[PDB]
Symmetry: D2
Subunit: 315 residues, 4 copies
Amino acid sequence: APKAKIVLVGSGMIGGVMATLIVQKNLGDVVLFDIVKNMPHGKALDTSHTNVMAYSNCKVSGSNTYDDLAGADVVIVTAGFTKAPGKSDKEWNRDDLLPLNNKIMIEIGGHIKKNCPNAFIIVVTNPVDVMVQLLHQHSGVPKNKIIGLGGVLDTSRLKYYISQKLNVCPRDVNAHIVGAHGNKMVLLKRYITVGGIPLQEFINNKLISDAELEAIFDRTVNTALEIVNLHASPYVAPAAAIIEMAESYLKDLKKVLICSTLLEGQYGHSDIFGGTPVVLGANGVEQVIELQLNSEEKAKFDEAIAETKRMKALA
Amino acid sequence: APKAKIVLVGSGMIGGVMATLIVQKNLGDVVLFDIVKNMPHGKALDTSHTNVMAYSNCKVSGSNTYDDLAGADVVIVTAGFTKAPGKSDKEWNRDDLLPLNNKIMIEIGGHIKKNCPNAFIIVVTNPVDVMVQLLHQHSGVPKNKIIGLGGVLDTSRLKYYISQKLNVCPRDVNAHIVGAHGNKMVLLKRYITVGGIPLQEFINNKLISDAELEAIFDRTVNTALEIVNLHASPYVAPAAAIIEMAESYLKDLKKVLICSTLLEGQYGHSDIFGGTPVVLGANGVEQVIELQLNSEEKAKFDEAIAETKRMKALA
Amino acid sequence: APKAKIVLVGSGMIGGVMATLIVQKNLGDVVLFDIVKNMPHGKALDTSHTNVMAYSNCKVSGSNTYDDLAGADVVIVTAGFTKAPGKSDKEWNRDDLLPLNNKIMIEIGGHIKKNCPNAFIIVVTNPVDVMVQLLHQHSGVPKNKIIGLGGVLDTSRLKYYISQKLNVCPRDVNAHIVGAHGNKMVLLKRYITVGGIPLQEFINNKLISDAELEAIFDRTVNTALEIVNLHASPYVAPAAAIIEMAESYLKDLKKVLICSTLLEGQYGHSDIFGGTPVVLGANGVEQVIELQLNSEEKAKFDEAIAETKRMKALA
Amino acid sequence: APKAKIVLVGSGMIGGVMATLIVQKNLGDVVLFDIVKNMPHGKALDTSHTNVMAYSNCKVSGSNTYDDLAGADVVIVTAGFTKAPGKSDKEWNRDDLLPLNNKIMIEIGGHIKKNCPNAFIIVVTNPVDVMVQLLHQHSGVPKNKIIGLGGVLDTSRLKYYISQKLNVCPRDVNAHIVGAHGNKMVLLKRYITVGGIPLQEFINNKLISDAELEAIFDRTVNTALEIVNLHASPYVAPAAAIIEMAESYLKDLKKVLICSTLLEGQYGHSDIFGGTPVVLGANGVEQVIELQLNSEEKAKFDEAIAETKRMKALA
Ligand SMILES: NC(=O)c1ccc[n+]([C@@H]2O[C@H](COP(=O)([O-])OP(=O)(O)OC[C@H]3O[C@@H](n4cnc5c(N)ncnc54)[C@H](O)[C@@H]3O)[C@@H](O)[C@H]2O)c1
Ligand SMILES: NC(=O)c1ccc[n+]([C@@H]2O[C@H](COP(=O)([O-])OP(=O)(O)OC[C@H]3O[C@@H](n4cnc5c(N)ncnc54)[C@H](O)[C@@H]3O)[C@@H](O)[C@H]2O)c1
Ligand SMILES: NC(=O)c1ccc[n+]([C@@H]2O[C@H](COP(=O)([O-])OP(=O)(O)OC[C@H]3O[C@@H](n4cnc5c(N)ncnc54)[C@H](O)[C@@H]3O)[C@@H](O)[C@H]2O)c1
Ligand SMILES: NC(=O)c1ccc[n+]([C@@H]2O[C@H](COP(=O)([O-])OP(=O)(O)OC[C@H]3O[C@@H](n4cnc5c(N)ncnc54)[C@H](O)[C@@H]3O)[C@@H](O)[C@H]2O)c1
Ligand SMILES: O=C([O-])C(=O)[O-]
Ligand SMILES: O=C([O-])C(=O)[O-]
Ligand SMILES: O=C([O-])C(=O)[O-]
Ligand SMILES: O=C([O-])C(=O)[O-]
């Protein structure tokens, strides 16, 4: 009334799952945009039939034409590479995607600025905390209208693994991972709860040990690498996390979700994007929540931001 | 496969909303049982038509026959009075329902024992922490198969009021209210989080004050009384809370939900029911979670239990 | 984005269920407006807490102030009486509500015209086909922006009863009831299908007989009277039907739903509202579908319209 | 209570989407079984994290071990090839998959018979009407406990394309495609409705022409080939169709869904599987609905069955 138009800039693995989920949730019309000929049209056609099964009414079209960004309410950018040429799966590292994906963000930014400067933008392309700022710079959109995927996905993994040990509903575990989406992501032990209860109570009761949690933390950090080596760069959970973010915007849910956003002094950092809880509603990023980190937690945050900064200089 | 059978023992205000929600969620077949002639049949007929609008397939029938408890998978007991004769709305107090509702619990307990001893039982009738134990005693069901409504409802109010001030999604506020469902309910300030973050951070940031929270606590405790004086004994949110509990059981969600359950030493209390977080799944109460209360919080818990104990002696 | 504002003009039995369902479906902010003091505020407060259980974010407020119609995207009018003074339940007839409810529609129409002339209006108050046109006249809204409840509800009953006999999913039965919502509602036997198959195939196979269908038709026509005599004027299924209609508008689903709408020559009738399939989407009534009735079916349609016309002259 | 166990025998493109949708809908625990090492474990891990985003509690595990079929409530067989070696995309034909997939069905059948003879089986592997009977023969399961995917998917395409022309909600178009899932699928023009109304009324009103419908029929038959040539063998809509079928079984919805099932005289055919409306509920195929085809429609049905029969002799 009128339906949202959601343009998926990138129609690869994450793009495909997002289109599926958008139709399931009847969230809006979908454009699967890609530079690859034919493929987005095929995925769009396949996906469009699910309107019947889902009792939805969302158009799904493919596109190779950047001007289809015109009219977009939400733009989700997954365009780019998941691996660097010559690198084995064992040495997979998001940092190595920087020289492959940087020029793509600049190009897409220019098209967003021309065609849909008032759209809400979600950047996914890795290394995401670098790429989101690059796209912010070139798209010209306001700081409250662009975020990067990271924390919703990283914490989904931490929350899930803890829930398996404790035999509780996965979403009843809450947790914070901040700073950057990469190997220096900051897993804040102090900010884990189970049914709203400090995780430390469960540790005290010997229901999960500190050593078990350490292993879960390592597993969380290395989850993408683990999945890359088993199969592929992850896509199902990334897509679900992105759609949770987009839905909070579209429906004005005002969920607290950890995303990469422009810092303007929070944690002692400015002029850079980093992962922190934000509130997503109809006005985009309605609030940037600054966790009251202690000095040791802040030092870990600084290590994460330093990686983003290092790569930004290489970009 | 086969569909759950859910018997609503009591087809009044809460019963009606529960039947509506069960059909919306396609949770199982419903029996609206009541002692009142004709009424449950009328409500059942009205409600049954919503299967079409909801794309569900749940039978909804009315009953005046206790033997319809046979085959029940879940029994929800709302049977009883919401007010005592002669009392004004201003002096409404759940304690005064004790002499009206006690004999009803005994009667229903006998029918559950005969007809559906393996059912999962949710007791709602006030004063609920007294009534749930009375029904436990007379139904003979295992301790893991019977709970009382309280904390999900009480905390829904606290969570909601805080969310309104902070402009976040209501369910992103988490909170614990324990001990008893009544005027001595224990609102645990230390156990409030917003997006998994200690509420104290928001207080420190002057986004909500300690004085504002005090007023919200008072409002939470007095919410039922407020609604009684505006309209009626509450029913929509009670129904939704009950269905959240029943659904966690039926679908094995293993949600952490605060309910009245048999204490066997937790908080220093035995041989009594009280409100505490529990995990609800396919095996009923799968875990009783004991909050690691400090001495001052425990003293408040003791005050709540003392009220339940006092009335149990009067019953 | 921004959330729809849905004003329920009338906060009685149907109003209450609608508010509940709106929060369940997260459809928009809700105002429960009524002339009765305190009651709508109490219902609103109770209902608002269900945002937590439902993972929704819809405001629910009560109102006695007509100016709260300002800003409404959807207005649902249930204001008025369900029974006439002095009449027994056995002689309940929607026609007798005419002198009670006519002035109410005029009053509400004036307030809609002043405060929300661009809102989409759903009229429920009986006798609905008369009341909807009266409100159209006094509100001044376009013909595509106002409909009356009838056919979705009447057919939910027919569809449901047939589904019970045939042991199929209720919504897999499709059926048309047209003309007017009252005792001369036209049940079109030729337009019944089961899984898209003509009902006649099932009759031929002796899975349901013509005599059984006749009894189901009578039951359908007399369903409201049946429920009135068992309990009350129906409210759960009416609410669900209304919300199905409102949702199709709000989400641009373009569902085909039978509603009372202004006829401009369809079926040989003009200058009157009657029940017919329409398509509801973002532009309101996007299409009025005229069934290609045979002469005998049309004669029944004429009998229904004649009742609406007779009462319009009395109004 | 206890959760269903759903084993996906085949963890390729359709398997992946099914696992995603099962978690979205919280339908049961999932095993992604495949002969490929590592891949199913990677997909399972990725998918499992979506329990958090979806508020679900479904295990998702990978497997290379056939014995994990033990305990299965539902088994969905997508194992096998989507294309034949040496064939271009332009000459893609499901018939050519016969020599590649036949031995796979026999092998899987033996493992089902040993490990989960009481499971409900959905066969997807092409050519599906041949493969489903082969699996029936080797698994030994009852005729009411095994179906093949076809008609839900084929009709989703027809329904969708018509809905686009008529600007109505996709699922408000109903249609039947019977006989076989392949190039001789029978598109029954007489059995198309829109909002329960004969499509012929819309043709009479010049809202869609007979020539337009002919083009839509051709498009429907050739949809898989179209998607193969644009992208890949279809997977998103196949997955959604399969999950609609599985869900109707698991939740006892009793939906009418067109599937491949054992014919025992319907349409004059026995000892073969073919596509026809069936009712899916807790007892599996609860009803086989025989459309009362006219002689010309039956001749088309016979042509479809003849293809299945021809390939069965080659198998
Ligand atoms: N931030 C996160 O939490 C997170 C998580 C997972 C993956 N990722 C990243 O997301 C990105 C996409 O992952 P995927 O699995 O979907 O990859 P993919 O390779 O399957 O899809 C990427 C698509 O981008 C397309 N593309 C390239 N240039 C384009 C352009 N200019 N415009 C439109 N499309 C273009 C490619 O043709 C391809 O189809 C990768 O960079 C990956 O590393 C980020
Ligand atoms: N625990 C909680 O958080 C909570 C919250 C709200 C209300 N309540 C309590 O729930 C109860 C029901 O509230 P309501 O608003 O639905 O009340 P209600 O008066 O509308 O309905 C109660 C129904 O119980 C019926 N009844 C009486 N004896 C019966 C019997 N032996 N078997 C079956 N039915 C019988 C009555 O006829 C009536 O229809 C009250 O006791 C109320 O105080 C508890
Ligand atoms: N069209 C249909 O299919 C259909 C179906 C069922 C009921 N109905 C009709 O819907 C109407 C409402 O039914 P209900 O069960 O909700 O009745 P109800 O008596 O419970 O509620 C009606 C409410 O309207 C209020 N009211 C009176 N004047 C008002 C005004 N000027 N502004 C706002 N509110 C006002 C009353 O105070 C009352 O709370 C009745 O007329 C009933 O006959 C229509
Ligand atoms: N009936 C229908 O309407 C319909 C529609 C679309 C596709 N299909 C068919 O479904 C099948 C699967 O399609 P897809 O897109 O998922 O193909 P896919 O190639 O992506 O996946 C098939 C999987 O089967 C696996 N496999 C092979 N042998 C196996 C065995 N013995 N046990 C377990 N797994 C085994 C492969 O390793 C592969 O991962 C194909 O035969 C396709 O033609 C049917
Ligand atoms: O960035 C990624 O690839 C991830 O974490 O899924
Ligand atoms: O017990 C009650 O009445 C309540 O809190 O709603
Ligand atoms: O109009 C009514 O009262 C009904 O049909 O529910
Ligand atoms: O069988 C197929 O490949 C299809 O129709 O999607």
